[PDB]
Amino acid sequence: EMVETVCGPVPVEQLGKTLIHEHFLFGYPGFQGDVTRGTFREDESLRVAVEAAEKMKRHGIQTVVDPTPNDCGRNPAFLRRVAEETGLNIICATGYYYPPYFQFRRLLGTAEDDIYDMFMAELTEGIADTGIKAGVIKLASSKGRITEYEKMFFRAAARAQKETGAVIITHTQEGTMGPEQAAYLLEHGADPKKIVIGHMCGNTDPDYHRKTLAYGVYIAFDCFGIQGMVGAPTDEERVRTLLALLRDGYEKQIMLSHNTVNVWLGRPFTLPEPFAEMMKNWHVEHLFVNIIPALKNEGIRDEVLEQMFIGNPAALFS
Amino acid sequence: EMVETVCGPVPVEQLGKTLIHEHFLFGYPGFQGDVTRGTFREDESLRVAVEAAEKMKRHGIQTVVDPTPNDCGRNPAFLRRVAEETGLNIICATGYYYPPYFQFRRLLGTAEDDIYDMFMAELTEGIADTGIKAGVIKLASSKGRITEYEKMFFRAAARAQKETGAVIITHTQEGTMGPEQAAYLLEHGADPKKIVIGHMCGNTDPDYHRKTLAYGVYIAFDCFGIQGMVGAPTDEERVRTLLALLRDGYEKQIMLSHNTVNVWLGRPFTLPEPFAEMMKNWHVEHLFVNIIPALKNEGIRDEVLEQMFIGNPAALFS
Ligand SMILES: CCCC(=O)N[C@H]1CCOC1=O
Ligand SMILES: CCCC(=O)N[C@H]1CCOC1=O
Ligand SMILES: [Fe+3]
Ligand SMILES: [Fe+3]
Ligand SMILES: [O-]
Ligand SMILES: [O-]
Ligand SMILES: [Zn+2]
Ligand SMILES: [Zn+2]
């Protein structure tokens, strides 16, 4: 029926056309240490975010999932300000990026319990004093493995999902562990229809994807526009991969996004022109402007795309 | 002549009796993600900190070095409030606890430069907008090695020390790398008389210490009261070790402290009773009330102790 957004509960029927994975703000853990050179300018950042939101509304986006983790600068009140200004629905996450705070607590024996308690509080009571609840649980695993640290979060996540029916969204590292993540969450009682395995576009072998899809989870091709960095494949390889699965009838299990960071937290930087040109398409219109057109030209039907941006999010949250 | 404190520049002659290593606030990196259950209560925390400061003043402490790293909740304005209330001098640090924020920047090729630039700005311009400058650079290495990540900070630190004459204070992990740290900083032009190698009390082999002292650096026995946790020796083993070096004439190179955390950031916790009893003496009076008395009884002279708490800090900062 309902999903919690940064502006409170909203009917799932009303979510409409949705990007499953975008960041208004994001910083890599440790950004907070770099405050003297990386101080947060709220009014300018709000301007950039409101601009990004409007752009999305231009292409009929009514809802955005912003899964920024707790230790990556998640800022619910700021997201609420963006939503209040634009009418955009924004759903935020509870979760951590892929030690030693939770490692210390593991020494105390309470760590996995504390993580569960955190998920429950943020899903059912509210984030800090913002009075905002998260709508998704955010998980991430490492390249080629789900570490013992990460598994605590996975187990906590599963446990929390059973109580709340919250959606789980995942991050996979460099195209690994898709099936392992799905299998492990299912072992601990999670519901596949409530799970999105993210960053699947980081692997070009459609066999890998089918292995993941066999579990009945959603997968996200959510890194469109990211090329030539962090061992990423090109958008063409993504399209090629995506086409294979669409033709094989998997549309009810696939969702698309860019994983943009519209305001970087911490110290400003400039990608060097080696990297810069390859990333030039990493913005929130790129799906609408460049990717979807190519898909049409390869005979993907509007009924199919609507399953991805409208039907799938709707089913996911219902 | 002068050292920067949280209340601005102060003549070194006026620093007086000094604890080289205590924390008013501290949290392990990642504490900020646990905001919903670990929210910071400023007025209560300020009360506890002011209490801790008064305790120290009772035993003639005029100056405290608080080397809380940037990503561990370092809060200069808060420290300034404690100092303004108590007349205590508090010197704070610039530095990081022992990825991926600075790992990402290493991908950009600017990381070590950015770190240096951060040290320079915080030593010579100010921390954020607080108008407070750090008085020490804070470094830490891992158990049994100084990683390539950590070396960036070491090289940045050395470089900064040459420009500013700032003091470097270090953390060693479980009694390793003392001599390596000293040797590496010296290779890059750091001045041994401006370096304190911390957590030396984590190793009980006085040969290890002498190896470190041969470089002409200060060493800190700064974990008094910490027992039965993370490879910590007992205070008795510390005393035994300390006595060997005092009798061998190293007093001009040794300093003492407790490495207290008076307000933990993040989620409150309680130590289990197995751990809790061993740690019962971990407070800022313990040196004064239990350790120094034992040293007197083993015939350590007041002239010697004064070299440690007064002469050494004074020489260190001058
Ligand atoms: C420039 C490299 C790509 C990148 O940083 N993507 C961001 C999006 C949010 O989480 C990520 O790591
Ligand atoms: C309870 C274990 C001991 C402990 O927490 N020491 C703290 C002091 C400050 O930096 C440390 O890591
Ligand atoms: Fe992301
Ligand atoms: Fe410390
Ligand atoms: O991401
Ligand atoms: O410490
Ligand atoms: Zn991700
Ligand atoms: Zn330390």
Automatic annotation (TrEMBL), chains A, B:
Q: Name one GO molecular function term.
A: hydrolase activity
- Residues annotated as binding Zn(2+) 1 are H21, H23, K138, N259
Entry binding sites for Fe(3+) 1: H21, H23, K138, N259
Instruction: Tell me the domain of life.
Output: Bacteria
Regarding protein family, the annotation reads: Belongs to the metallo-dependent hydrolases superfamily. Phosphotriesterase family.
The molecule here is called: Phosphotriesterase
- Source species of the chain: Geobacillus kaustophilus (strain HTA426)
Q: Give the record's keywords alphabetically.
A: Hydrolase, Metal-binding, Zinc
**Binding locations of Mn(2+):** K138, H171, H199, N259
Q: Does the keyword Lipoprotein apply?
A: no
Q: Which residues bind Fe(3+) 2?
A: K138, H171, H199
Q: What EC number is given for this enzyme?
A: 3.5.-.-
Q: Which residues carry this modification: N6-carboxylysine?
A: K138
